[PDB]
Amino acid sequence: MNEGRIFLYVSPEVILPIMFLILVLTSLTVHFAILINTTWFGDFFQGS
Amino acid sequence: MNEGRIFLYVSPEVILPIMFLILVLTSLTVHFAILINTTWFGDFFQGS
Amino acid sequence: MNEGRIFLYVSPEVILPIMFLILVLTSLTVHFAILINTTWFGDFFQGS
Amino acid sequence: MNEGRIFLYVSPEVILPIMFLILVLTSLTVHFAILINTTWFGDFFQGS
Amino acid sequence: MNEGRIFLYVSPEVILPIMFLILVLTSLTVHFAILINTTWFGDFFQGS
Amino acid sequence: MNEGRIFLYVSPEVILPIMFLILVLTSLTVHFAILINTTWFGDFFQGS
Amino acid sequence: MNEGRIFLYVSPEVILPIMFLILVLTSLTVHFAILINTTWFGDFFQGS
Amino acid sequence: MNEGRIFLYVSPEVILPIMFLILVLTSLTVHFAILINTTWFGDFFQGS
Amino acid sequence: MNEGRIFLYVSPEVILPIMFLILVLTSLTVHFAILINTTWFGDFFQGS
Amino acid sequence: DTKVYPTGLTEAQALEINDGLKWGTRIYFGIAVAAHILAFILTPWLK
Amino acid sequence: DTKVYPTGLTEAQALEINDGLKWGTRIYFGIAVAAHILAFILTPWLK
Amino acid sequence: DTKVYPTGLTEAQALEINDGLKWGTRIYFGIAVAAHILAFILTPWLK
Amino acid sequence: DTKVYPTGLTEAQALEINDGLKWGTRIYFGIAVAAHILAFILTPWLK
Amino acid sequence: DTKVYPTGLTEAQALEINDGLKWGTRIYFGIAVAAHILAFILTPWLK
Amino acid sequence: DTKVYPTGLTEAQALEINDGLKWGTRIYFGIAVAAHILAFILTPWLK
Amino acid sequence: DTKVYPTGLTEAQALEINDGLKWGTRIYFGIAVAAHILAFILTPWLK
Amino acid sequence: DTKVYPTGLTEAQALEINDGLKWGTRIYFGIAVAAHILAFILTPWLK
Amino acid sequence: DTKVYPTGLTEAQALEINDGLKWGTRIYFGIAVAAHILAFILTPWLK
Numbered sequence: 001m002n003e004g005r006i007f008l009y010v011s012p013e014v015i016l017p018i019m020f021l022i023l024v025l026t027s028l029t030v031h032f033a034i035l036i037n038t039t040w041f042g043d044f045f046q047g048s
Numbered sequence: 049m050n051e052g053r054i055f056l057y058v059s060p061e062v063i064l065p066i067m068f069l070i071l072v073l074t075s076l077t078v079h080f081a082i083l084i085n086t087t088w089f090g091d092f093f094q095g096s
Numbered sequence: 097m098n099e100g101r102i103f104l105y106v107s108p109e110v111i112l113p114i115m116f117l118i119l120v121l122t123s124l125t126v127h128f129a130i131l132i133n134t135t136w137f138g139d140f141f142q143g144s
Numbered sequence: 145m146n147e148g149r150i151f152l153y154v155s156p157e158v159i160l161p162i163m164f165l166i167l168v169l170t171s172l173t174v175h176f177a178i179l180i181n182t183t184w185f186g187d188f189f190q191g192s
Numbered sequence: 193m194n195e196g197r198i199f200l201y202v203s204p205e206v207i208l209p210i211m212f213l214i215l216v217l218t219s220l221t222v223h224f225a226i227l228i229n230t231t232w233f234g235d236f237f238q239g240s
Numbered sequence: 241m242n243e244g245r246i247f248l249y250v251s252p253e254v255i256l257p258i259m260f261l262i263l264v265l266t267s268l269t270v271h272f273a274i275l276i277n278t279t280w281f282g283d284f285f286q287g288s
Numbered sequence: 289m290n291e292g293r294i295f296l297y298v299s300p301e302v303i304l305p306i307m308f309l310i311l312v313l314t315s316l317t318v319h320f321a322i323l324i325n326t327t328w329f330g331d332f333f334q335g336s
Numbered sequence: 337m338n339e340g341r342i343f344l345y346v347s348p349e350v351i352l353p354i355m356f357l358i359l360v361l362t363s364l365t366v367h368f369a370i371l372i373n374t375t376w377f378g379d380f381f382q383g384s
Numbered sequence: 385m386n387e388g389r390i391f392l393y394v395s396p397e398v399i400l401p402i403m404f405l406i407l408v409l410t411s412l413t414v415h416f417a418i419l420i421n422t423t424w425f426g427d428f429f430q431g432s
Numbered sequence: 433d434t435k436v437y438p439t440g441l442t443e444a445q446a447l448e449i450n451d452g453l454k455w456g457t458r459i460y461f462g463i464a465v466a467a468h469i470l471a472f473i474l475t476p477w478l479k
Numbered sequence: 480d481t482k483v484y485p486t487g488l489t490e491a492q493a494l495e496i497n498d499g500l501k502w503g504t505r506i507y508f509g510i511a512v513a514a515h516i517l518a519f520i521l522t523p524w525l526k
Numbered sequence: 527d528t529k530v531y532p533t534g535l536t537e538a539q540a541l542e543i544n545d546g547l548k549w550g551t552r553i554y555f556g557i558a559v560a561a562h563i564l565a566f567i568l569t570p571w572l573k
Numbered sequence: 574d575t576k577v578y579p580t581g582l583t584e585a586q587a588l589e590i591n592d593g594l595k596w597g598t599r600i601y602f603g604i605a606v607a608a609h610i611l612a613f614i615l616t617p618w619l620k
Numbered sequence: 621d622t623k624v625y626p627t628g629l630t631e632a633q634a635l636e637i638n639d640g641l642k643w644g645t646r647i648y649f650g651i652a653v654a655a656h657i658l659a660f661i662l663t664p665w666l667k
Numbered sequence: 668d669t670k671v672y673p674t675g676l677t678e679a680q681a682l683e684i685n686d687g688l689k690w691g692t693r694i695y696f697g698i699a700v701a702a703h704i705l706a707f708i709l710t711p712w713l714k
Numbered sequence: 715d716t717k718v719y720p721t722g723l724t725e726a727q728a729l730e731i732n733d734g735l736k737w738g739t740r741i742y743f744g745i746a747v748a749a750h751i752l753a754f755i756l757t758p759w760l761k
Numbered sequence: 762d763t764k765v766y767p768t769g770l771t772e773a774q775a776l777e778i779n780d781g782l783k784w785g786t787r788i789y790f791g792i793a794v795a796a797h798i799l800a801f802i803l804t805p806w807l808k
Numbered sequence: 809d810t811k812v813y814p815t816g817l818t819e820a821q822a823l824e825i826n827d828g829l830k831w832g833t834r835i836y837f838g839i840a841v842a843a844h845i846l847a848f849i850l851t852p853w854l855k
């Protein structure tokens with residue numbers, strides 16, 4: 001029951017870039033959601 | 049019936065990344081819909 | 097008549113992922129349309 | 145004249161998925177346009 | 193001058209799907225422009 | 241200088257469909273810009 | 289230094305269509321920016 | 337535990353351009369977020 | 385160290401068009417940001 | 433006859449695909465006519 | 480029979496794929512009918 | 527004649543595709559003219 | 574058995590992939606059930 | 621002459637493709653001039 | 668131990684990639700835990 | 715000389731393409747200068 | 762050693778690419794630290 | 809030396825491409841510096 005055997009059926013050259021892209025987009029989405037839906041993080045950017 | 053035979057006609061290298069993308073996008077869509085259509089989860093982000 | 101013969105002319109590796117994408121996007125579109133165009137399902141999310 | 149001969153010059157694997165995509169998107173576009181530009185179908189969703 | 197010779201240099205499998213997509217999108221664009229920029233066709237949808 | 245030698249280095253199957261796509265998109269863009277930025281052609285659709 | 293030798297390393301079939309797309313999009317972007325950010329060119333369209 | 341071995345399974349020609357695109361888009365996203373969510377950097381552009 | 389060896393592993397035909405696209409889009413992004421976030425450059429377009 | 437075209441199909445196969453598309457189009461048209469009749473009956477459209 | 484088509488499949492394989500899609504569509508329809516009954520009971524729709 | 531071009535087609539096949547496109551465009555134009563007459567009659571356009 | 578299909582896999586390999594997807598789906602379902610219980614407890618959803 | 625370039629075409633073929641593009645652009649220009657004259661006459665533009 | 672799969676890899680290589688992904692995931696988790704602790708301390712969230 | 719590079723072209727062909735781009739850029743620049751002079755004359759820009 | 766992997770590279774080449782990425786990352790980090798110090802000095806951020 | 813890498817290029821060719829990009833970046837930098845000086849003089853920026 002070794003999930004790594006998925007790499008025997010899905011080539012890493014196809015899936016690994018996809019998951020890297022998804023990780024980047026997900027982190028950017030968390031940051032954007034917090035930026036939009038809060039007053040801080042937007043006042044921290046503003047400073048004083 | 050044996051649905052695993054779907055991999056005898058559709059290559060896993062083509063379909064598995066697609067459904068992984070579907071999982072990611074669907075989870076992000078649920079989270080975004082709840083974020084937009086509720087006052088909490090957006091007040092939980094705000095805190096106090 | 098036998099519509100399965102379409103798989104003799106359209107490779108399943110090309111058409112089946114496309115129809116899976118169509119099914120996913122159509123379900124998401126129905127859910128999003130009901131979310132946008134109703135007061136409930138958006139108050140069910142809100143709770144009390 | 146025989147329009148089926150187009151399949152002798154355009155491979156069905158390229159054109160048939162495209163026309164399926166067109167059919168799906170056109171049906172969704174009709175439904176979305178009626179949803180946006182009418183008061184009913186959006187009150188039928190709302191119910192009472 | 194024979195414009196059919198455009199198919200001796202551009203493969204029909206590449207260009208014909210493109211022009212079909214263009215035809216579909218152009219018809220949808222005309223319909224959408226009429227829908228957006230008129231009061232009728234949007235009152236014909238709603239009826240009475 | 242014979243600008244027809246551009247097809248000895250760029251295959252027509254790549255450039256001619258592309259230039260047709262820009263022709264269509266540019267015509268649609270001119271029409272859309274005039275439609276948006278004027279009162280007529282939007283009163284011509286409406287009629288009386 | 290000869291900048292044509294880039295064509296010994298970048299296929300003209302790949303780069304020339306891209307730069308043609310860039311030229312078209314840049315011209316359309318200049319026209320759109322002037323259209324949006326001015327009162328004339330939008331009154332020239334309107335006429336009298 | 338050498339992370340260079342990721343290049344023995346993922347082609348650098350596929351992953352390196354993707355990560356360069358990610359770097360560019362992330363820098364542009366930081367700049368755009370600060371531009372949108374602050375009064376300065378938008379008053380620094382304005383000058384006096 | 386010699387960064388030119390990046391072309392021994394990444395094909396110039398793949399990376400050079402990508403970086404040209406990045407350069408074009410970045411310049412257009414700077415111009416658009418200054419256009420949007422200033423009163424001048426938009427009054428320079430307007431003239432008098 | 434028995435000629436293979438650049439798509440890899442013979443004329444009979446191409447005509448079979450055409451007849452199939454036409455038959456499916458007729459079934460789709462019948463279902464769409466039923467749906468339009470139901471819409472006319474139930475929705476305020478055309479009234 | 481035993482004929483290989485341009486997609487690389489035989490008639491039996493193509494018909495098996497069709498039967499599979501039809502079999503899965505019925506389970507999808509059953510789950511959708513259950514979901515629509517639950518929606519009718521719980522949501523204000525159709526009321 | 528009998529000359530195969532980079533697309534894999536001969537001149538006769540290319541001219542056949544052209545004639546087919548012209549015939550289809552003529553049918554499309556006929557239907558479009560009928561639709562435009564109907565639009566002129568029924569819609570406030572051009573009135 | 575020992576038959577190679579157009580995708581390049583045998584029946585045993587295709588069934589192994591299916592079993593893996595089902596096992597990962599059950600783990601995902603367990604985590605999702607835990608997350609939904611936590612959401613019900615901690616959020617105003619469902620009273 | 622008779623020299624095949626990386627696109628698979630000879631110089632004469634590319635030149636006659638260019639001549640065809642020029643002929644088509646001239647026809648397009650004629651139709652566009654007619655359309656612009658009609659627009660000037662009918663639309664409130666350049667007036 | 669020697670079989671080559673359709674992707675072109677063996678079982679040992681596929682397990683090495685999995686172990687690598689798991690190790691990088693643990694490092695990412697550690698950095699994320701540190702970042703979340705800092706966010707809890709500084710940002711007006713969860714308090 | 716007579717060397718074929720990974721793109722399939724020799725130095726003479728690559729320099730021909732460069733000379734062509736440079737030659738077309740000058741005609742584009744001339745038309746752009748004419749258009750900018752006309753814009754300066756006819757539009758409120760730069761006045 | 763002297764073993765070609767599915768990507769067509771050896772271990773030494775893959776490790777050289779890794780060291781290159783790490784060296785470029787350090788240069789980028791230095792420039793970014795300088796830019797962040799300048800931002801802290803000039804911008805109203807963190808003050 | 810005299811070694812073909814997976815991209816099909818030798819070290820000398822790869823370094824020539826790098827030198828080309830670096831040489832072009834300096835002309836781009838000079839034009840950008842001139843444009844920024846003109847912007848500083850003519851625009852309200854940095855004033």
Ligand code: BCL
Binds near residue numbers: 115168171460467500
């Ligand atoms: C607008 C006012 C009316 C209305 C009147 C009209 C009229 C009039 C018509 C329709 C038509 C349709 N309407 Mg309607 N319709 C209304 C509201 C709805 C709503 C809703 C949310 O209330 C639903 C869901 C529908 C649904 C539909 C469909 C039954 C049909 C779309 C035809 C089509 O082109 O499909 C395109 C297909 C899709 C969009 C999705 C494609 C699905 C594919 C096949 C999925 C395949 C799955 C695959 C096998 C899975 C593979 C998995 C892997 C192997 C693992 N309507 C209302 C209230 N509607 C038309 C019809 O009946 O045509 C037949 C029609 O004529």
Ligand code: BCL
Binds near residue numbers: 068510
């Ligand atoms: C609209 C008013 C109603 C409602 C009534 C309706 C009605 C009526 C129906 C649904 C239907 C559904 N609704 Mg609903 N529904 C509501 C609110 C929700 C909400 C929510 C946030 O509240 C959720 C999440 C759902 C969820 C769902 C699903 C159970 C189902 C979608 C079918 C479909 O086509 O899926 C498409 C699939 C996706 C979108 C995701 C696909 C997932 C894929 C398979 C992931 C594969 C993973 C892969 C193996 C991973 C590989 C990884 C690598 C190997 C590493 N609904 C509300 C309150 N809903 C329908 C149904 O039951 O049909 C079966 C249905 O008939």
Ligand code: BCL
Binds near residue numbers: 370377414793796800
């Ligand atoms: C936000 C408040 C601050 C500010 C503080 C920050 C901080 C803090 C940092 C930056 C960073 C950067 N900022 Mg800033 N920055 C500000 C405003 C600006 C403005 C402006 C219009 O005012 C400019 C243009 C910049 C520019 C930059 C860059 C110097 C740098 C981006 C790094 C990066 O990831 O690039 C990504 C690359 C791109 C976006 C474009 C890529 C270009 C490629 C290489 C083009 C190649 C061309 C190719 C060779 C052509 C081929 C042609 C063919 C061969 C024919 N900033 C303001 C006022 N900025 C960061 C930095 O210094 O990192 C090094 C950094 O740490």
Ligand SMILES: COC(C)(C)C/C=C/C(C)=C\C=C/C(C=O)=C/C=C/C(C)=C/C=C/C=C(C)/C=C/C=C(C)/C=C/C1=C(C)C[C@@H](O)CC1(C)C
Binds near residue numbers: 097098170220
């Ligand atoms: C934009 O503004 C709005 C408001 C939207 C208005 C605009 C609307 C516009 C512009 C257009 C709207 C709609 C439109 C147009 O125009 C629709 C046309 C629909 C059509 C033509 C549908 C056709 C469907 C045909 C199908 C599903 C056929 C399938 C056949 C299959 C799969 C197989 C058949 C078979 C084959 C191969 C082999 C044989 O051995 C056996 C057999 C089984 C026979």
Ligand SMILES: COC(C)(C)C/C=C/C(C)=C\C=C/C(C=O)=C/C=C/C(C)=C/C=C/C=C(C)/C=C/C=C(C)/C=C/C1=C(C)C[C@@H](O)CC1(C)C
Binds near residue numbers: 119495502
């Ligand atoms: C836009 O406005 C809104 C409001 C959204 C309204 C608009 C809505 C519109 C236009 C449309 C809505 C919906 C719609 C319109 O058709 C839906 C249709 C859904 C359908 C047909 C779903 C079908 C699913 C079928 C599935 C999952 C089948 C899977 C089978 C599989 C994977 C395998 C089976 C098998 C195979 C291969 C081999 C065999 O050996 C063994 C076996 C195991 C058998």
Ligand SMILES: COC(C)(C)C/C=C/C(C)=C\C=C/C(C=O)=C/C=C/C(C)=C/C=C/C=C(C)/C=C/C=C(C)/C=C/C1=C(C)C[C@@H](O)CC1(C)C
Binds near residue numbers: 225267543
């Ligand atoms: C943007 O602002 C708005 C308001 C939208 C205004 C803007 C609108 C603009 C800019 C443009 C609008 C529209 C436009 C332009 O311009 C339309 C043109 C439509 C045309 C040319 C349609 C043509 C259709 C032709 C078809 C379907 C032909 C099909 C033929 C087929 C499939 C086969 C034929 C055959 C072949 C091969 C083989 C033979 O053996 C047998 C035979 C059977 C013969």
Ligand SMILES: COC(C)(C)C/C=C/C(C)=C\C=C/C(C=O)=C/C=C/C(C)=C/C=C/C=C(C)/C=C/C=C(C)/C=C/C1=C(C)C[C@@H](O)CC1(C)C
Binds near residue numbers: 005125131591
């Ligand atoms: C749009 O409006 C909103 C509000 C969003 C509502 C709409 C929501 C909608 C429509 C849908 C929501 C959700 C949904 C649906 O529907 C979710 C479904 C999730 C599923 C099915 C998840 C499944 C995960 C499965 C995984 C991760 C499996 C992994 C297995 C792996 C990696 C490998 C296993 C193995 C394999 C292969 C090879 C063997 O050698 C070894 C072995 C180890 C065995």
Ligand SMILES: COC(C)(C)C/C=C/C(C)=C\C=C/C(C=O)=C/C=C/C(C)=C/C=C/C=C(C)/C=C/C=C(C)/C=C/C1=C(C)C[C@@H](O)CC1(C)C
Binds near residue numbers: 195269320639640
């Ligand atoms: C936002 O800003 C807005 C408002 C949009 C304003 C901005 C607008 C801008 C920037 C630009 C606008 C427009 C523009 C520019 O610039 C337009 C140019 C149009 C042109 C050049 C059209 C040309 C068409 C030519 C065609 C269709 C030729 C076809 C020829 C074919 C298919 C075949 C011919 C032949 C061949 C091969 C073989 C021979 O044997 C026989 C022969 C038959 C001869």
Ligand SMILES: COC(C)(C)C/C=C/C(C)=C\C=C/C(C=O)=C/C=C/C(C)=C/C=C/C=C(C)/C=C/C=C(C)/C=C/C1=C(C)C[C@@H](O)CC1(C)C
Binds near residue numbers: 034341
């Ligand atoms: C949408 O609404 C908001 C608010 C955003 C909320 C929604 C959020 C949602 C839905 C999800 C959020 C987040 C999430 C989930 O879910 C995140 C998961 C992150 C994960 C799993 C990160 C993992 C990282 C792993 C990495 C970087 C691994 C790298 C390994 C590498 C490069 C190499 C390793 C190695 C290899 C190969 C060979 C060995 O010899 C040596 C070794 C060096 C070991």
Ligand SMILES: COC(C)(C)C/C=C/C(C)=C\C=C/C(C=O)=C/C=C/C(C)=C/C=C/C=C(C)/C=C/C=C(C)/C=C/C1=C(C)C[C@@H](O)CC1(C)C
Binds near residue numbers: 241245314412742
């Ligand atoms: C938001 O910000 C806004 C407002 C948009 C402002 C921002 C604008 C910005 C950032 C940039 C704007 C514009 C810009 C920059 O920068 C423009 C540059 C234009 C250029 C370089 C155009 C060049 C055209 C060249 C052409 C058409 C050459 C064609 C040559 C051809 C087809 C063939 C020639 C030949 C060849 C090959 C083979 C020989 O055998 C025979 C021969 C005949 C010799």
Ligand SMILES: COC(C)(C)C/C=C/C(C)=C\C=C/C(C=O)=C/C=C/C(C)=C/C=C/C=C(C)/C=C/C=C(C)/C=C/C1=C(C)C[C@@H](O)CC1(C)C
Binds near residue numbers: 029035777780786787
């Ligand atoms: C969304 O909300 C906002 C506000 C945006 C906040 C969100 C921000 C988020 C989520 C993230 C932000 C940023 C981030 C993360 O996370 C940044 C990381 C940047 C990094 C790691 C940059 C690294 C750069 C490295 C470079 C350029 C390396 C190049 C090396 C090259 C080309 C070549 C080197 C060489 C090689 C190969 C061969 C050798 O022989 C010789 C040698 C010359 C050595």
Ligand SMILES: COC(C)(C)C/C=C/C(C)=C\C=C/C(C=O)=C/C=C/C(C)=C/C=C/C=C(C)/C=C/C=C(C)/C=C/C1=C(C)C[C@@H](O)CC1(C)C
Binds near residue numbers: 293367407410831
């Ligand atoms: C988002 O918010 C805003 C406001 C936009 C702010 C954000 C801005 C940000 C994040 C970034 C901005 C800008 C930026 C960064 O960062 C710019 C960098 C530009 C650069 C590096 C340009 C470089 C250009 C180089 C060129 C054109 C080189 C070309 C060389 C060529 C074609 C050929 C040369 C040659 C070769 C091959 C062969 C030899 O034999 C002969 C020779 C002829 C030598």
